[PDB]
């Protein structure tokens, strides 16, 4: 059946047919919703996935059933038949990557989906090569502050024994350190990976914002350590437009958000290493990285300098300190000519994107739990937007951290 | 289905295991290939249909009270059965009904205040026959629940649906709400939410004051007759003028709200029986008023005005002038209710208490259905503990259900 979604502030109702195209399971059943749960090949398996992907490729370019289509199908079959896998054409790789982004139910920045610089790194064979490709990515994507969306794609998985993996969760992330007293210096989310790096020979400065090094694994081999040239790492000192004491807090963050731990699945093929990068929505930094209890956890300190009444929770002193911090972040990146979107602008763009997608594509999978920003929820349009969620392919999936499987 | 489902809290790392979901009764709207978790909403029963529903419930009751398989249990089954054979329905004892109402609350996956579920004063109004009697019962509800501002949760239960042609209904969505009036210029006065019901009221003969906070009259249907209008005694309606602990100008906004949230349009389903008029009340979470009632664009929509008075730069959105005003408004709401000693809970306290509730439910009950989309407060989500808490959502019965608005279905006499 067709399904309607309503926006309760504007009363707009879109009709969803696209959901009928999916085959992967969301996790829910008719009796149990898991919408707030974070995580709910052979030749025989490989061809239909290949065939479905090529079919939608040639359908997207309005040449379905054509000679090129037929031959390509024959070509891919004849290759899986004799190699137990197949290689994507350059065209398919780019279409595939942009469509994985287009299909990411959790991404509020999808209005940018078709503007994506794809770097083919399928000829890479070593970690040194990986470091080269990654360094080129960062310099390109950063672009002196005028960030650009990029993705660098390393060889697809073969037997599982020879995966390319980027061990860092993001190409640029700060170190975290378990102190003697049991506290954490720096970013607590990275304490494990920070220790693995040190175990491998990395000499840590042991400060609050130390850039982690790259840990790259090629062809299933032991991973290797590489320092990103500091000139390639754009960072922003966080200050406040009215509060001149905010710089005293000693806050900074990096400009490039570049996720490196995911798995890009195309046409039945698995790219275990596909670090991609966009730009920030301020709350990522302002709300989550800085204020989460398990993260930098600065709320109390900020509210102290704000001299707020902190005895009872009903002074909303946390809510006060929160808005001010996120103002600082947006003010800093802007003042430094580094690309950054606030959550009002971002969510609006997403609504506008949704309407585009419904009109041209008959739907748009969207994960309300993730789309709604972690602050000021209902004063953004997305809060009032009914969304449907389903899994379309190609896509970005999660994968085991490498240090749980890899044998040295 | 899997018999053991795990949920994690990513802030504390606590994992809980859910087994209660196995006793799920109705469809959620979701399937294996699609999730409807952000969808707001995704002629009677018969003899053969009612037996399993009643027995299911009765078994559950005698289970709670540790008398399962007893003489009293088996006799109650025999009595309910015979009643359904001979009258096509059955009547709940006063104990079964109270249990039932408390558990519909306990089962409410969308409700962040369920830690209070066991403290619910239940008024049995099954002897009601007229609209005037409904109004009597409803006035008594309000006075007791209000309690001079030290509010107490309560429910009044009217006779159950029988053949569908004699339903009791409260046409109000809440017993206390403000009128909305559509002007010929397109602008609305009062509360945009209640414009349709306000119009219905004027049709039925209400002479509206036509102001910004005018308490709606009650529209009451008993036994399937046409509804009748009654004015709630003003002395029974506790209100709070909204002011700010720091901004003197905030009182000049002329803002007030009522103390008692009193939802009156849900259906209460217990053991296959349908109580189409079951007004219930609790007390407010601050955000309901400060964020939703006040700042929603389709509602009172005061953000711009509050921002103007805060002298905020409102050209660009990245100044966060909206977020700045929203917090202040919510501080004022909380500050006012507390100053007038009217019970109210901030979103930090409530979400925090619900986590404790949820954990205890997993412990003593094997689970606790919850709607993350609804539980997480509409402001500062990630800085409350429920944002980080994985929840499973599913429908247990007894339950509060939605039902069509009565003017859509009522055959006028
Ligand atoms: C261009 C500007 C972009 C913006 C403003 C943006 C915004 C966001 C935000 C705010 C999230 C929430 C993630 C979190 O809270 O941890 C997200 C998630 C996500 N984004 Fe985008 N993004 C952008 C670019 C991209 C690109 C270039 C890709 C891939 C090619 C992408 C794919 C994804 C995926 C797969 C997720 C899911 C995250 C997860 O599963 O953990 N985004 N995005
Ligand atoms: C005692 C204090 C209570 C608090 C703080 C509380 C809190 C809340 C809040 C904040 C909501 C969201 C409402 C909305 O966003 O529109 C809600 C929903 C709900 N509550 Fe509670 N609640 C309380 C009492 C009760 C009681 C006494 C009952 C019934 C006996 C109840 C049953 C429900 C139900 C069925 C919903 C779903 C609302 C809907 O579907 O529209 N609650 N609660
Ligand atoms: C494994 N777990 C629990 C877990 C998995 C993913 C996350 C979120 C990681 N994704 C962050 C992320 C991913 C892609 C992005 C794209 C653009 C952007 N501005 N931020 C972005 C941020 C958190 C926890
Ligand atoms: C028909 N639609 C679109 C619609 C349905 C329900 C809602 C939410 C109404 N729920 C209100 C409600 C219900 C129970 C409550 C219990 C306690 C409390 N403080 N507020 C409470 C508030 C909004 C729109
Ligand atoms: C339990 C819940 O699913 C988890 O906390 C989610 C909630 N929504 C989120 N939304 C975004 N954008 N990012 C997140 O990490 C999360 N975390
Ligand atoms: C579209 C979305 O499902 C809708 O706006 C919901 C979201 N969560 C909510 N949560 C609460 N508590 N109350 C609401 O009215 C809503 N509205
Ligand atoms: Zn679901």
From Swiss-Prot, chain A:
Function: Produces nitric oxide (NO) which is a messenger molecule with diverse functions throughout the body. In the brain and peripheral nervous system, NO displays many properties of a neurotransmitter. Probably has nitrosylase activity and mediates cysteine S-nitrosylation of cytoplasmic target proteins such SRR.
Family label: Belongs to the NOS family.
Gene: NOS1
Record GO terms (molecular function): arginine binding; cadmium ion binding; calcium channel regulator activity; calcium-dependent protein binding; calmodulin binding; flavin adenine dinucleotide binding; FMN binding; heme binding
Subcellular location: Cell membrane, Sarcolemma; Cell projection, Dendritic spine
GO terms for biological process, alphabetical: arginine catabolic process; calcium ion transport; cell redox homeostasis; cellular response to growth factor stimulus; establishment of localization in cell; multicellular organismal response to stress; myoblast fusion; negative regulation of blood pressure
UniProt keywords, alphabetically: Calmodulin-binding, Cell membrane, Cell projection, FAD, Flavoprotein, FMN, Heme, Iron, Membrane, Metal-binding, NADP, Oxidoreductase, Phosphoprotein, Synapse, Ubl conjugation
Nucleotide-binding keyword on record: no
Amino-acid positions noted as binding (6R)-L-erythro-5,6,7,8-tetrahydrobiopterin in the UniProt annotation, renumbered to this chain: 36, 369-370, 383
Entry GO terms, CC: calyx of Held; caveola; cell periphery; cytoplasm; cytoskeleton; cytosol; dendritic spine; membrane raft
Domain notes: The PDZ domain participates in protein-protein interaction, and is responsible for targeting nNos to synaptic membranes. Mediates interaction with VAC14.
Top-rank taxon, per record: Eukaryota
Full-sequence range covered: 304 to 721 of 1434
Residues the entry annotates as binding heme b: 107, 398
Subunit structure: Homodimer. Interacts with DLG4; the interaction possibly being prevented by the association between NOS1 and CAPON. Forms a ternary complex with CAPON and RASD1. Forms a ternary complex with CAPON and SYN1. Interacts with ZDHHC23. Interacts with NOSIP; which may impair its synaptic location. Interacts with HTR4. Interacts with SLC6A4. Interacts with VAC14. Interacts (via N-terminal domain) with DLG4 (via N-terminal tandem pair of PDZ domains). Interacts with SLC6A4.
Protein name: Nitric oxide synthase 1
Post-translational modification note: Ubiquitinated; mediated by STUB1/CHIP in the presence of Hsp70 and Hsp40 (in vitro).
Entry comment describing in which tissues the protein is expressed: Isoform 1 is ubiquitously expressed: detected in skeletal muscle and brain, also in testis, lung and kidney, and at low levels in heart, adrenal gland and retina. Not detected in the platelets. Isoform 3 is expressed only in testis. Isoform 4 is detected in testis, skeletal muscle, lung, and kidney, at low levels in the brain, but not in the heart and adrenal gland.
Residues engaged in binding L-arginine: 170, 279-280, 284
Lineage: Eukaryota, Metazoa, Chordata, Craniata, Vertebrata
UniProtKB/Swiss-Prot annotation, chain B:
Protein name per the record: Nitric oxide synthase 1
Domain notes: The PDZ domain participates in protein-protein interaction, and is responsible for targeting nNos to synaptic membranes. Mediates interaction with VAC14.
Function per UniProt: Produces nitric oxide (NO) which is a messenger molecule with diverse functions throughout the body. In the brain and peripheral nervous system, NO displays many properties of a neurotransmitter. Probably has nitrosylase activity and mediates cysteine S-nitrosylation of cytoplasmic target proteins such SRR.
Species lineage: Eukaryota, Metazoa, Chordata, Craniata, Vertebrata
Domain of life where this protein originates: Eukaryota
Binding residues for heme b: 111, 402
Binding site for L-arginine: 174, 283-284, 288
Entry comment describing in which tissues the protein is expressed: Isoform 1 is ubiquitously expressed: detected in skeletal muscle and brain, also in testis, lung and kidney, and at low levels in heart, adrenal gland and retina. Not detected in the platelets. Isoform 3 is expressed only in testis. Isoform 4 is detected in testis, skeletal muscle, lung, and kidney, at low levels in the brain, but not in the heart and adrenal gland.
